[PDB]
Amino acid sequence: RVSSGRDLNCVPEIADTLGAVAKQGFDFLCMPVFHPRFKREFIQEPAKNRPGPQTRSDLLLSGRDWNTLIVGKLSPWIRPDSKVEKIRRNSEAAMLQELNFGAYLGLPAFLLPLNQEDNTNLARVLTNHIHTGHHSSMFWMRVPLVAPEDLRDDIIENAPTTHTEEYSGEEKTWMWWHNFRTLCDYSKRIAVALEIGADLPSNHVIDRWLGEPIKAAILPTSIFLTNKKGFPVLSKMHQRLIFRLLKLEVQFIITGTNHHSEKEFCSYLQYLEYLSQNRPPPNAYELFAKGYEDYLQSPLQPLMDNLESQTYEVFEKDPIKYSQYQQAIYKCLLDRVPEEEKDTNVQVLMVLGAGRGPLVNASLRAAKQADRRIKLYAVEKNPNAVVTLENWQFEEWGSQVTVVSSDMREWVAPEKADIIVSELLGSFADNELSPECLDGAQHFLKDDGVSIPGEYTSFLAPISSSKLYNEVRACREKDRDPEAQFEMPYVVRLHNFHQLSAPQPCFTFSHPNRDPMIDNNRYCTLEFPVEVNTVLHGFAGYFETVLYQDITLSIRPETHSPGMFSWFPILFPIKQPITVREGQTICVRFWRCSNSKKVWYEWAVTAPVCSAIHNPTGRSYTIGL
Amino acid sequence: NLPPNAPACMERQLEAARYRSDGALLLGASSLSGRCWAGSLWLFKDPCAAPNEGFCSAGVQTEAGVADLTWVGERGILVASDSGAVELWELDENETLIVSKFCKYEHDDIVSTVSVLSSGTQAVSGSKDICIKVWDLAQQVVLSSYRAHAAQVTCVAASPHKDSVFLSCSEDNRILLWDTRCPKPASQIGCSAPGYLPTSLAWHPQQSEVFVFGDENGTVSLVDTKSTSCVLSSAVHSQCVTGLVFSPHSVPFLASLSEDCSLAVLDSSLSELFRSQAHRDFVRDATWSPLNHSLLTTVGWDHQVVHHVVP
Numbered sequence: 001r002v003s004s005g006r007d008l009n010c011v012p013e014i015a016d017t018l019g020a021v022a023k024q025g026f027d028f029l030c031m032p033v034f035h036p037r038f039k040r041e042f043i044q045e046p047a048k049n050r051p052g053p054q055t056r057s058d059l060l061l062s063g064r065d066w067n068t069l070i071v072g073k074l075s076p077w078i079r080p081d082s083k084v085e086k087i088r089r090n091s092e093a094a095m096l097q098e099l100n101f102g103a104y105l106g107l108p109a110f111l112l113p114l115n116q117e118d119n120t121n122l123a124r125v126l127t128n129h130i131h132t133g134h135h136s137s138m139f140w141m142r143v144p145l146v147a148p149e150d151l152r153d154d155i156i157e158n159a160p161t162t163h164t165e166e167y168s169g170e171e172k173t174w175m176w177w178h179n180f181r182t183l184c185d186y187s188k189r190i191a192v193a194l195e196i197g198a199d200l201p202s203n204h205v206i207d208r209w210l211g212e213p214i215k216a217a218i219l220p221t222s223i224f225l226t227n228k229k230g231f232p233v234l235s236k237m238h239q240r241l242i243f244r245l246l247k248l249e250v251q252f253i254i255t256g257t258n259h260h261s262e263k264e265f266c267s268y269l270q271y272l273e274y275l276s277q278n279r280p281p282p283n284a285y286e287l288f289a290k291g292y293e294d295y296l297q298s299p300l301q302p303l304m305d306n307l308e309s310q311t312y313e314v315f316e317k318d319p320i321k322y323s324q325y326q327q328a329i330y331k332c333l334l335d336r337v338p339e340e341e342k343d344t345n346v347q348v349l350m351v352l353g354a355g356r357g358p359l360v361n362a363s364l365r366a367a368k369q370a371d372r373r374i375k376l377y378a379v380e381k382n383p384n385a386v387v388t389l390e391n392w393q394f395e396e397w398g399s400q401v402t403v404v405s406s407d408m409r410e411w412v413a414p415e416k417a418d419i420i421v422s423e424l425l426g427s428f429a430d431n432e433l434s435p436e437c438l439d440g441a442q443h444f445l446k447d448d449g450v451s452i453p454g455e456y457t458s459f460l461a462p463i464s465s466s467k468l469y470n471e472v473r474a475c476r477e478k479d480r481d482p483e484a485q486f487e488m489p490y491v492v493r494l495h496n497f498h499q500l501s502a503p504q505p506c507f508t509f510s511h512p513n514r515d516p517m518i519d520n521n522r523y524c525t526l527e528f529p530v531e532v533n534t535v536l537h538g539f540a541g542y543f544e545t546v547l548y549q550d551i552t553l554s555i556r557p558e559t560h561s562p563g564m565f566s567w568f569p570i571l572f573p574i575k576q577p578i579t580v581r582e583g584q585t586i587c588v589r590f591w592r593c594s595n596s597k598k599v600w601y602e603w604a605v606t607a608p609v610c611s612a613i614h615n616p617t618g619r620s621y622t623i624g625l
Numbered sequence: 626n627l628p629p630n631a632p633a634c635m636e637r638q639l640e641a642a643r644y645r646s647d648g649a650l651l652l653g654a655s656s657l658s659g660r661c662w663a664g665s666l667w668l669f670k671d672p673c674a675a676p677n678e679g680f681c682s683a684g685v686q687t688e689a690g691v692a693d694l695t696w697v698g699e700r701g702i703l704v705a706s707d708s709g710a711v712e713l714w715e716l717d718e719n720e721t722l723i724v725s726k727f728c729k730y731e732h733d734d735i736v737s738t739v740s741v742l743s744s745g746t747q748a749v750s751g752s753k754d755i756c757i758k759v760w761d762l763a764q765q766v767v768l769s770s771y772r773a774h775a776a777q778v779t780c781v782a783a784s785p786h787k788d789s790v791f792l793s794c795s796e797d798n799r800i801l802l803w804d805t806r807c808p809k810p811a812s813q814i815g816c817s818a819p820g821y822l823p824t825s826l827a828w829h830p831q832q833s834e835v836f837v838f839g840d841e842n843g844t845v846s847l848v849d850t851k852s853t854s855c856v857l858s859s860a861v862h863s864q865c866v867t868g869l870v871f872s873p874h875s876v877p878f879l880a881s882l883s884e885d886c887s888l889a890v891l892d893s894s895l896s897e898l899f900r901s902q903a904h905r906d907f908v909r910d911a912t913w914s915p916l917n918h919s920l921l922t923t924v925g926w927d928h929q930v931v932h933h934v935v936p
């Protein structure tokens with residue numbers, strides 16, 4: 001299922017050309033809206049008074065066709081950054097005319113090239129068009145992986161091609177894009193149409209496009225190799241990039257004439273459909289996460305707020321998570337009570353934050369496996385979840401389980417526990433306040449008692465994602481700090497991003513907390529080596545937890561628990577993007593702060609440059625105690 | 626009376642005007658606006674009856690527009706098309722029809738410039754796809770393909786008497802001297818200063834190591850390939866120099882085409898002798914009469930075929 005388009009710069013009859021590309025199987029068509037050679041004058045007479053029409057009529061297609069099948073293209077003679085003033089003034093007038101016409105037609109996308117370093121005036125004129133009205137139309141900046149100057153044949157005897165490695169120079173077209181979208185102030189309407197050449201650049205040059213809003217990939221017919229039967233095909237390296245772009249769900253565009261003339265134009269299409277059908281299928285996690293890609297969510301605050309029914313339902317449909325919890329209990333029971341005591345000793349187990357009872361059931365299953373005697377207390381503060389627990393206790397569990405409707409920090413337990421079990425962990429481990437909860441409860445755990453989980457560690461990693469930076473920027477709410485959306489974390493399935501350095505551990509908590517003076521506050525400095533040129537947009541947060549001994553759960557990509565889809569990564573953004581060069585170190589500082597009523601995080605980048613301290617005093621984000 | 630196969634009307638945008646050795650005018654026209662964006666080829670054995678369709682010797686329509694044209698001998702017509710094809714059309718045995726010889730889609734974008742090489746067996750083309758292709762007219766194939774430029778190819782001009790030599794100029798600011806005999810065929814030439822983009826080229830018809838070029842600012846420059854640093858230059862036009870054509874004279878005159886809607890006629894020192902504001906739109910070609918050397922014909926986007934009497 002590849003959505004594809006045909007790029008044409010020659011359309012004699014619009015209807016016949018449209019029907020032609022349709023028969024060939026193309027979903028849309030990129031075409032000129034004014035004749036590409038029809039240079040127009042706006043200042044100088046007599047050419048200014050040229051009789052009309054200036055182009056073909058809108059009546060030639062239905063409104064629907066214009067909205068869905070046509071991608072406009074700027075005329076190649078429009079040069080807003082030309083050194084000739086007369087050309088600069090005229091191209092500004094022509095650029096506006098063409099863009100206004102495409103907006104008049106209701107075109108879904110419109111293409112403009114970035115075929116040189118300086119596009120300041122092209123940016124001034126486009127930005128101006130965006131701020132003239134309020135529309136949904138996209139602008140696809142046609143930009144190549146390799147600039148033409150860097151891919152030209154070595155055939156100029158007195159002007160030869162440089163055979164030296166220029167790490168930064170090979171990434172010149174990315175800088176063209178970067179500068180153009182910076183000038184246009186990261187408009188959500190401006191995206192990349194990435195043109196792939198016959199020869200691929202170094203992987204660093206390709207990786208430089210990670211986290212960028214790529215909406216289209218342009219494949220010229222020329223890059224296609226010929227197979228033994230005469231069919232157009234691609235090199236193993238070109239396939240790698242195609243597969244990468246398929247994940248980003250870009251629209252593929254075929255540009256150029258048919259060079260495999262024995263076959264039809266649908267042969268270029270058939271190859272892409274074949275490549276699309278022959279990729280690894282969506283695995284349990286990738287199938288689950290589908291739809292949530294780069295979708296920002298507020299992290300849950302299950303202590304302050306009572307969770308909804310369908311939320312516990314989602315938590316529950318994660319077999320791996322509770323399989324591991326079962327195994328951690330099963331292991332702890334054998335270690336605590338020997339086979340000789342298998343009928344004398346009854347273990348007091350306390351599920352702290354029982355929800356709808358998945359850990360109460362997992363404890364029962366662990367006992368009917370370890371063949372040991374257990375007493376259960378199912379503590380839950382959410383009275384709505386307690387209704388589920390008490391209807392469970394009556395109809396199944398019986399007197400074996402004591403349902404407690406209380407806050408675990410307030411509860412006066414009749415006896416002590418051998419094991420306190422809980423699932424109070426967030427995507428950043430301690431973000432749902434697992435430390436504070438378990439500290440208020442550890443008074444009713446036996447002097448030799450076990451906590452499942454016994455330990456948890458959060459991890460941070462610097463990331464680049466212009467898509468997620470803009471996604472956050474758009475989270476501006478009235479009646480609050482206009483910059484507040486940057487001073488809060490988000491639970492998101494990070495998809496279009498680039499991990500700038502390996503995750504490093506951030507905050508660690510251990511239960512029981514045997515410390516004489518318990519302090520859950522933290523200050524931590526991380527130094528991240530970056531071996532690429534990039535733009536820092538924020539930090540991806542993850543976690544790892546020891547439930548019991550070797551039985552663990554992890555969302556850190558290097559050690560991610562297989563098939564476990566409960567927690568998505570967390571994101572700590574920064575207000576202003578930070579330029580990072582190859583070889584530099586990203587230094588971040590994170591604090592975990594609290595008072596008697598609330599807990600929060602503060603953060604700051606101190607290298608290569610400083611950021612402001614994010615979330616001072618919990619002004620934008622706090623977690624209620 | 627309109628000939629058989631010839632279209633009822635001619636497309637407004639007149640692109641090319643080429644006098645044959647016998648005095649018969651060849652026309653190239655494109656439909657650049659309106660519903661259909663195609664082109665056509667015309668022959669006027671009576672040049673004073675053009676652009677009137679019903680008073681032509683031959684006429685045909687092309688699939689797409691006509692960006693450039695050139696006479697391949699006395700019966701052949703080589704066309705640079707928007708389709709990406711370089712087309713060869715041949716005159717009828719009676720010279721009453723214009724029949725398709727070949728239509729090869731080799732370029733990935735609009736073909737904008739064509740020049741047939743001194744022999745007449747080969748030709749060179751320049752496209753917006755940044756390529757330059759050397760063609761075998763007889764074999765109907767591309768012999769060589771050169772990606773020397775970094776932006777679209779604006780002009781390609783074959784040497785008057787060398788089948789290996791030809792000039793090219795692009796929006797990448799390079800003027801390239803080509804010699805297919807050299808292992809690296811192109812060589813970057815021109816004045817010391819980079820200046821403004823080159824738009825048009827014209828070899829000298831007598832001095833085989835001299836040519837002229839027009840820039841995007843209206844400047845016409847006199848260049849020696851040898852001294853490879855220009856001496857003479859005249860700001861002939863207020864806008865882009867579209868074309869440069871040399872008169873058939875032993876001491877040739879230089880016709881200057883422009884987007885400023887004017888025509889100028891210059892001498893050996895690039896001085897103005899004539900000027901015509903006759904056109905109301907862009908001047909797209911110039912062709913000196915073979916029969917009357919002091920007669921010069923121009924076409925424009927205003928659908929005019931003006932015949933100038935050059936003093």
Ligand SMILES: Cc1ncnc2c1ccn2[C@@H]1O[C@@H]2[C@@H](Oc3ccc4cc(Br)c(N)nc4c3)CC[C@]2(O)[C@H]1O
Nearest residue numbers: 302303315353355380381382407408423425426566567
């Ligand atoms: C002081 C106190 N006393 C008694 N109960 C308490 C408290 C503090 C919290 N709770 C209870 O703990 C339960 C918590 O269970 C879960 C279950 C699954 C999760 C999955 C993910 Br993904 C995730 N991010 N977090 C999860 C949290 C949240 C929902 C819950 O039922 C609260 O009411």
